[PDB]
Design a protein around this ligand. Structure first.
Ligand SMILES: [K+]
Lengths: 306, 306
């Protein structure tokens, strides 16, 4: 029994984290084969950041301007290119600990593990959701940039996020490993508003299913609802619209528990309208939305890796 | 900067997890040097479990009764001993991936990362507290036993927990790596009651400090209190007494924020009595108690590992 914010095991990613330094800026890089990936803003000074011309700043850089340290081993940079907002430093050594990996672009609502690093060394691991507004509510400090988010399938690491910046609101933004930001953000120190953050409805439902599996059934009610009637109530409480695709993905959990998706939707409707009356679900007084349907299945069925 | 249930990186522990099989039972073992540690109840059948005489059950066992698999590599058992409730299988091979480690017995309140495993293979990693009643509110399924809890200092893994059993209440119990149960529990299938669980006061305070660091200052009040006056209020809300040792360990955070421990205590007093008025601290509507003072320092200062 029990249910936790459970992260993927970090071992495979630990062995890819390096320190990258340029000028006075030190952040993290991801070392896969003979390439180190890191945020390109590492080449910028404080003043460059206000309006950086990256094409120009990079032409003015040479390989020796980049210091890459893997543990107590200096990696020599022998090449550099830029892909969107990621810097690719070609190094003299293929990472012996390179795992099987893919670069994946995730959708809002999907979750991943983050290996928060400083100076190429891991500080911790935690589970995360890509928020609907394309931010993530991470735990990152100065120098966290280059830290990556990932999922694991079997033995294959699917890298989906690289951390680039913190916004004034204290939430975080970054790119896929091709250097394309998630959301309407740029690696420039210019005012940038997060879109309004909404609650990931399908994930709340998934977590309610988790709660049922673990006993909690008090929120189950006698009501039912149509999909559209639900979404009308949801929108009023800043909940993402629930699509048919979402309903379909919840199918496995609806089958496991025997509770139909729209029935669970009704249970949520009431919770939104009335509240919880000081009661808690899976130890939480708030409706948790950082667990996907698949995440519940994985934790409740005991899926392992490598 | 944000705040998350953040686990230690699992890499070092991943490389120590093996599968151990005996009779009708498969669970997990921890492979350090030429020894594999696992719960001794692996030698029991269903019938043995009702009233096991372990000294006698083990005398009747031979090395060949124990099948240890590290991936697709069979480890040959060449010896067996019992230390309290842990079985130590001596094998023909020292684990090449043995990290620097200690075996530590933690105190109630203290936290650790758990690497949940099935069949010697990791499913995930999550942060945990040793509850005051010596249970842990884990996420474990059938076959999780042998899974370990740990902290890391620099490069040294301090193993503090091995999972042995789930109790009727759905919470978990186990031993230090010397095989001594935490709490009044035994590795017998006989009814066993968890003591009443209390809230880990020192940890709630630590987490309030974390909240200050991340902005939230609304719960700060002008009032102060003596230690005893605080504990009188605490006991009424099922909070662990706050000791002077607790005050001392909160020292770093009190220094960092400039808020005195007893001042923070007063702020907590009010929160306990009046509630939050539907407000939230670090995204939570409940007072969180599974973060130690050190855990907050590590997350908020960016402490890394190896
Ligand atoms: K219902």
């Amino acid at each position: 029994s029990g249910f936790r914010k459970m992260a993927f095991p970090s071992g495979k990613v630990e062995g890819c984290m390096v320190q990258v330094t340029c000028g006075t800026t030190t952040l993290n890089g991801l070392w896969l084969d003979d390439v180190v990936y890191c945020p390109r803003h590492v080449i910028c000074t404080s003043e460059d950041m206000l309006n950086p011309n990256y094409e120009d700043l990079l032409i003015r850089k040479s390989n020796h301007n980049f210091l890459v340290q893997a543990g107590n081993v200096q990696l020599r940079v022998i090449g550099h290119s830029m892909q969107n907002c990621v810097l690719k430093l070609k190094v003299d050594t293929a990472n012996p600990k390179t795992p099987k990996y893919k670069f994946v672009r995730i959708q809002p609502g999907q979750t991943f593990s983050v290996l928060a690093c400083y100076n190429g060394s891991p500080s911790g691991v935690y589970q995360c959701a890509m928020r609907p507004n394309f931010t993530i509510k991470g735990s990152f400090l100065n120098g966290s940039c280059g830290s990556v988010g990932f999922n694991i399938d079997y033995d294959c690491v699917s890298f989906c996020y690289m951390h680039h910046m913190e916004l004034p609101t204290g939430v975080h933004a970054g790119t896929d490993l091709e250097g394309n930001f998630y959301g309407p953000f740029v690696d420039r120190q210019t005012a940038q508003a997060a879109g309004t953050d909404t609650t990931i409805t399908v994930n709340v439902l998934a977590w309610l299913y988790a709660a049922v599996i673990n006993g909690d059934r008090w929120f189950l009610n006698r009501f039912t609802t149509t999909l559209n009637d639900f979404n009308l109530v949801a929108m009023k409480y800043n909940y993402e619209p629930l699509t048919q695709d979402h309903v379909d993905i919840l199918g496995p959990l609806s089958a496991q528990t025997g509770i139909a998706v729209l029935d669970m939707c009704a249970s949520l409707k009431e919770l939104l309208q009335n509240g919880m009356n000081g009661r808690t679900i899976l130890g939480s007084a708030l409706l948790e939305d950082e667990f996907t349907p698949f995440d519940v299945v994985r934790q409740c069925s005991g899926v392992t890796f490598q």
